[PDB]
Write a protein that binds this ligand. Structure first.
Ligand code: CHL
Ligand code: CHL
Ligand code: CHL
Ligand code: CLA
Ligand code: CLA
Ligand code: CLA
Ligand code: CLA
Ligand SMILES: CC1=C[C@H](O)CC(C)(C)[C@H]1/C=C/C(C)=C/C=C/C(C)=C/C=C/C=C(C)/C=C/C=C(C)/C=C/C1=C(C)C[C@H](O)CC1(C)C
Ligand SMILES: CC1=C[C@H](O)CC(C)(C)[C@H]1/C=C/C(C)=C/C=C/C(C)=C/C=C/C=C(C)/C=C/C=C(C)/C=C/C1=C(C)C[C@H](O)CC1(C)C
Ligand SMILES: CC1=C[C@H](O)CC(C)(C)[C@H]1/C=C/C(C)=C/C=C/C(C)=C/C=C/C=C(C)/C=C/C=C(C)/C=C/C1=C(C)C[C@H](O)CC1(C)C
Ligand SMILES: CC1=C(/C=C/C(C)=C/C=C/C(C)=C/C=C/C=C(C)/C=C/C=C(C)/C=C/C2=C(C)CCCC2(C)C)C(C)(C)CCC1
Lengths: 86, 219, 221, 97, 221
């Protein structure tokens, strides 16, 4: 089956990886941008958007990190397919 | 017996008092009064030779136990690629990798170059920390740091710490002597330490060292 | 030039030895020629232990430089005893009858290397430890030249010729160490005896010299 | 520019670690075997091209040599690496971030 | 930038070396990275003799590395020598037709190694006794950097860059000493020239490294 294959594992791993990287202060999020030197500094947030998450994780945060992790997983699976590893 | 001060363990027995140099008073571990060749008269050179001797002793203890351990374990049931220590390095280029305990899923290393590179990086960091200082201790004794080595708290009570120091350096000098013996028993025989021990304990009359006393003769 | 001491003395570079001879080599010891270009003996304690080590090396090298030439020197007369070279002389222990001293069978003729090895270890440890510390012939004296029973013939008196014979001893000893290193490497490279090398050099010097054996240790691989 | 009244002689802030680290950061990755090269590397094929072109030393390389490709790509990446290395070194040393 | 003198300078362990340097290596001499971890030069006169040994070793190793690289590069470029590889270049005196210098028979055409060695002993004894004492190319001068006959190009003037040139000389000399040790051990374990080993390592670096010759000097045989 697909659910449980290498592609699905890699994709969920990449998506949850970016999500847990943004949630636990290891990746740039809505509330924390970066400078030229990649140091996490806060943001204006340009609207203000609420969230019940203790850290402040938002629906925008999950959309952004889902898109990034989906790009990462797509690229990884099609690369491993490209070098014959998959 | 006290291993410090004026009357201590001396290398020529109960009659060596002429053979003691003036600079070997005995305020350091393992002082037997043996500098009859006189290379360690300068106190700073005495410091450098002491740290040289202690780290040679510790590395030769590790090397003696590593010379004897896989050869003894070769007869205890497990079989490696090579069991003797002087061919224990050449098991990289054998087909099928360097298995650690013989098991093919333990290490299985085929590349000696990246192995030496990773060793060079980690060993350069360890020895730079050992001489200068680093994250497991910044400024301490150059030979006996504490607080991260001996974490079990046996370095306290400085009289038994002094006894532990002289015991460490005596076991280390014995292991240095045996490492030199391992080197020459490698070059004149080609068989390992416990292999030569079985060769001696089989018949000691002819299979002593003088069985190989004519090997390096010239032509 | 008739002195081996003082500030002006025979030196190892001859007339080229004024810019040499540093301050701690003053000529106060037998055999001072100003040769400390490596600078190994700045400390007089280090210098004292190096002088003791050099002179016992000198005594053992004068013993060795004659004990290596006399088996071939009695093989010159035609006395056959197993082998005459010194670097293959130990294996006569493991012969069919054992190592004989002069070849005549009623002589020493010992067979076991381990028993005479143990005897050598015990009496040489005792003798050398008496040499370093002291024993039944003088307890605390010079570690270099004890004398007493070591001079039964009375050459230790009149200290100027004692110093002169000290310089003679260290000069013949340095020549003997040089000769013994030459013996070692003539055994290593040529593989024949040194007196046999002398016979081969006197038979043909121009083609048989060290440069004939210059291409032996060439690593082929 | 109220400052800069003499055109300082150290207009380029030379750290000798920069060229070394750029050559290292481009060339060591330039010696990784990729199957597009047939298991060989860009820099390895470059040294091979220079070896073949050094055989006929006076005459220069041809137009269909494939030496020029390796040269130009290797130097593109190399100059970019060295340039960005100097930039980064004097941006970390100076401000700019 | 980075300097090579004073209390802070370029050191042997790099950034992890502020505790590592000894007390006697204050850094007034060229090439003072503070590497005396065995304490061989704690006495300052031993340190001075070791500096002279290091610098003369450095200059001779620079000449030797250039002379080991030069005829092999000229052979791989154009020139048929007698034997361009350096550890077999001695026996060209035994090539039955002379030692041609640049491969041409119009050159030095040497056939007698004893006369070559003898004139080398004469000229080398003269020049080294001049180096330690003085002679026609300067009498009272620095024993390591004489000048005014070994600087006809005047590069020791402006002494702030003469210190930099001293550090450059000792650094290329230590690199040449390391490279001469590499030449020696590579000659022993590979049997080919350093440029032949370089062409081998450039052809297939994965197996023409040193570890293919790791089983060569095995202790079994
Ligand atoms: C009172 C008698 C007594 C004597 C004479 C010695 C003397 C010695 N102790 Mg000892 N001790 C003695 C009592 C005691 N010791 C010690 C504690 C120690 C220690 C901790 C150490 C010694 C060591 C030594 C040795 C140092 C000398 C040396 O380096 O060998 C130089 C002389 C030789 C090597 C001659 C032997 C060679 C052999 C006879 C000839 C064979 C030649 C071969 C064919 C080789 C030739 C090669 C060819 C191919 C070119 C020596 C065996 C040291 C040691 O073990 O060094 C090795 C050492 O570390 N002793 C204690 C406890 C307090 C003693 C108590 O009584
Ligand atoms: C200490 C001085 C000493 C020296 C220089 C030698 C030399 C030698 N013995 Mg030896 N022995 C010595 C003491 C003793 N031996 C023996 C008993 C034997 C036996 C039974 C045999 C030998 C043999 C040999 C020769 C080994 C052939 C070889 O490998 O050539 C290569 C080596 C050389 C050409 C000489 C190179 C010199 C060396 C590299 C430098 C010298 C410095 C030494 C390392 C320091 C000496 C050791 C110290 C610690 C005592 C070798 C020349 C064998 C032989 O002759 O048959 C071939 C042999 O069968 N020896 C005893 C017990 C009585 C000794 C005790 O004093
Ligand atoms: C002192 C420096 C010096 C060095 C490093 C060499 C190097 C060599 N010469 Mg050479 N020579 C040197 C001086 C001289 N040579 C010669 C004339 C010859 C001839 C005729 C021949 C040689 C040969 C050899 C080679 C011996 C083969 C071998 O055993 O390889 C194994 C060993 C190595 C590769 C390295 C050896 C170096 C050593 C272990 C470490 C360095 C220590 C120093 C040499 C000692 C210091 C010397 C002091 C006294 C100044 C060896 C590579 C032979 C040759 O090449 O034929 C095939 C040969 O036939 N040489 C003359 C007279 C003009 C010299 C005078 O200065
Ligand atoms: C496990 C990690 C992994 C692996 C093994 C690969 C492996 C591969 N990727 Mg993928 N990739 C990954 C992660 C990975 N990728 C991730 C995380 C992303 C998201 C950023 C991508 C995005 C990505 C894209 C967008 C492309 C690849 C491509 C490739 C292939 C060839 C690249 C090449 O030779 O161009 C070498 C190219 C040059 C040396 C010159 C490029 C010149 C450009 C045009 C100048 C501008 C190769 C199979 C390429 C592909 O699929 O082609 C078949 C491709 O276009 N990758
Ligand atoms: C290379 C290892 C090494 C080093 C650096 C030292 C260094 C030292 N030892 Mg130790 N020692 C060693 C090995 C070593 N030893 C071994 C193997 C033994 C057992 C045989 C001993 C037994 C021993 C005793 C019993 C005593 C010392 C003492 C000393 C000090 C003064 C002697 C001297 O000048 O040594 C200089 C050493 C060298 C220059 C090393 C050269 C190595 C050569 C090539 C070896 C040649 C023979 C093989 C000095 C700190 C004395 C001391 O101060 O105690 C604290 C003392 O009483 N040592
Ligand atoms: C191992 C033997 C030995 C030892 C310990 C000494 C020790 C000493 N000598 Mg003596 N000497 C020796 C052998 C030795 N020498 C020989 C064989 C010669 C004749 C060539 C001389 C000729 C000589 C003269 C003319 C003078 C000295 C002097 C000195 C003193 C200061 C020099 C110094 O630091 O040497 C330290 C030496 C060593 C630590 C020995 C190291 C041995 C190495 C391994 C030799 C390496 C060289 C090479 C590989 C082998 C020889 C090559 C070639 C020459 C054949 C010192 C007491 C001077 C002095 O003050 O007078 C008392 C002095 O004027 N010596
Ligand atoms: C200093 C080294 C050197 C020397 C002596 C020459 C000399 C020459 N080159 Mg070469 N060349 C060089 C470096 C050199 N070139 C470099 C670095 C590149 C890049 C080229 C690329 C090159 C090409 C593409 C061609 C030459 C050609 C030539 C010849 C006519 C010009 C002449 C013999 C021409 C020739 O004779 O063929 C030619 O077509 N050269
Ligand atoms: C004291 C004195 C005094 C007087 O005065 C003078 C004199 C005499 C000089 C002096 C003496 C000295 C001496 C004796 C020295 C010696 C040393 C040594 C032996 C060392 C070793 C040392 C040794 C050592 C470190 C060792 C080490 C080892 C090691 C790491 C390891 C190894 C190994 C192993 C197992 C594993 C594999 O399988 C392989 C190998 C890799 C192989
Ligand atoms: C001075 C100086 C100065 C500067 O500054 C620095 C320097 C350079 C370092 C220095 C130098 C030094 C030197 C030269 C050294 C050398 C030495 C030697 C050679 C020794 C030997 C030494 C040697 C010796 C003792 C020897 C001995 C010998 C012997 C016993 C032998 C024996 C024998 C015999 C009889 C015979 C039999 O069958 C066998 C045998 C057993 C074999
Ligand atoms: C610093 C320190 C510190 C601590 O404390 C301690 C220790 C560790 C001990 C120290 C270290 C030291 C070291 C590293 C040493 C090394 C050295 C060397 C390598 C030298 C060479 C050295 C080397 C050298 C001079 C060389 C020279 C060479 C030559 C002339 C050559 C010549 C030649 C040629 C052209 C070619 C031809 O066909 C032949 C011949 C004849 C072959
Ligand atoms: C409730 C909660 C939770 C959980 C949650 C979750 C589980 C979430 C998830 C989330 C997620 C899981 C998300 C995802 C997302 C995704 C996305 C957002 C996607 C996107 C996509 C895209 C954007 C695409 C793109 C593209 C394409 C189309 C093609 C190719 C190219 C590219 C790749 C660009 C927790 C922890 C339990 C607890 C508390 C709270």
């Amino acid at each position: 089956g697909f659910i449980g294959s290498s592609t699905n594992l890699i994709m969920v791993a990449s998506t949850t990886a970016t999500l847990a990287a943004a949630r636990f202060g290891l990746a740039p999020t809505v509330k924390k941008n970066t400078t030229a030197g990649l140091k996490l500094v806060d943001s204006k947030n340009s609207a203000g958007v609420i969230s019940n998450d203790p850290a402040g994780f938002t629906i925008v945060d999950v959309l952004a990190m889902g898109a990034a992790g989906h790009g990462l997983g797509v690229g990884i699976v099609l690369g491993l397919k490209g070098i014959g590893a998959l | 017996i006290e291993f410090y001060g004026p009357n201590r363990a001396k290398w020529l027995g109960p009659y060596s008092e002429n053979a003691t140099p003036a600079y070997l008073t005995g305020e350091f571990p393992g002082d037997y009064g043996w500098d009859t060749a006189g290379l360690s008269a300068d106190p700073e050179t005495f410091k450098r030779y002491r740290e040289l001797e202690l780290i040679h002793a510790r590395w030769a203890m590790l090397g003696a136990l590593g010379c004897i351990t896989p050869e003894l374990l070769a007869k205890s049931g497990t079989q490696f690629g090579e069991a003797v220590w002087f061919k224990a390095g050449a098991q990289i280029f054998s087909e099928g990798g360097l298995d650690y305990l013989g098991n093919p899923s333990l290490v299985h290393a085929q590349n000696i170059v990246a192995t030496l590179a990773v060793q060079v990086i980690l060993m350069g960091l360890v020895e730079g920390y050992r001489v200068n200082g680093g994250p497991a201790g910044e400024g301490l004794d150059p030979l006996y740091p504490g607080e991260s080595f001996d974490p079990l708290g046996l370095a306290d009570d400085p009289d038994t710490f002094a006894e532990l120091k002289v015991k460490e350096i005596k076991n280390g000098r014995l292991a240095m002597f045996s490492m030199f013996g391992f080197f020459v028993q490698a070059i004149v025989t080609g068989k390992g330490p416990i292999q030569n021990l079985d060769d001696h304990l089989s018949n000691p009359t002819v299979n002593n060292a003088f069985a190989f006393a004519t090997k390096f003769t010239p032509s | 030039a008739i002195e081996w001491y003082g500030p002006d003395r025979p030196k190892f570079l001859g007339p080229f030895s004024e810019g040499d001879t540093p301050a701690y080599l003053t000529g106060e010891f037998p055999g001072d020629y100003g040769w400390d270009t490596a600078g190994l003996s700045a400390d007089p304690e280090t210098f004292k232990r190096y002088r003791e080590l050099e002179l016992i090396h000198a005594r053992w090298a004068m013993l060795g430089a004659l004990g290596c030439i006399t088996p071939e020197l009695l093989a010159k007369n035609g006395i056959p005893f197993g082998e005459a070279v010194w670097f293959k002389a130990g294996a006569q222990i493991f012969a069919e009858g054992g190592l004989n001293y002069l070849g005549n069978e009623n002589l020493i003729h010992a067979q076991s290397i381990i028993a005479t090895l143990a005897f050598q270890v015990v009496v040489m440890g005792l003798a050398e430890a008496y040499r370093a510390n002291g024993g039944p012939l003088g307890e605390g004296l010079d570690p270099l030249h004890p004398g007493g029973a070591f001079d039964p013939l009375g050459l230790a008196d009149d200290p100027d010729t004692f110093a002169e014979l000290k310089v003679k001893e260290i000069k013949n000893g340095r020549l003997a160490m040089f000769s013994m290193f030459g013996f070692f490497v003539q055994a290593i490279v040529t593989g024949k005896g040194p007196i046999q090398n002398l016979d081969d050099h006197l038979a043909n010097p121009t083609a048989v010299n060290a440069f004939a054996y210059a291409t032996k240790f060439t690593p082929s691989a | 520019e109220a400052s800069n009244k003499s055109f300082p002689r150290d207009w380029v802030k030379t750290d000798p670690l920069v060229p070394v680290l750029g050559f290292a950061g481009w060339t060591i990755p330039a010696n990784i075997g990729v199957s597009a090269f047939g298991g060989q590397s860009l820099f390895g094929l470059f040294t091979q091209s220079i070896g073949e072109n050094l055989a006929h030393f006076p005459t220069g390389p041809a137009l269909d040599d494939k030496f020029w490709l390796y040269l130009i790509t290797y130097h593109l990446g190399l100059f970019l690496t060295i340039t960005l290395g100097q930039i980064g070194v004097q941006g970390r040393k100076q401000g700019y971030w």
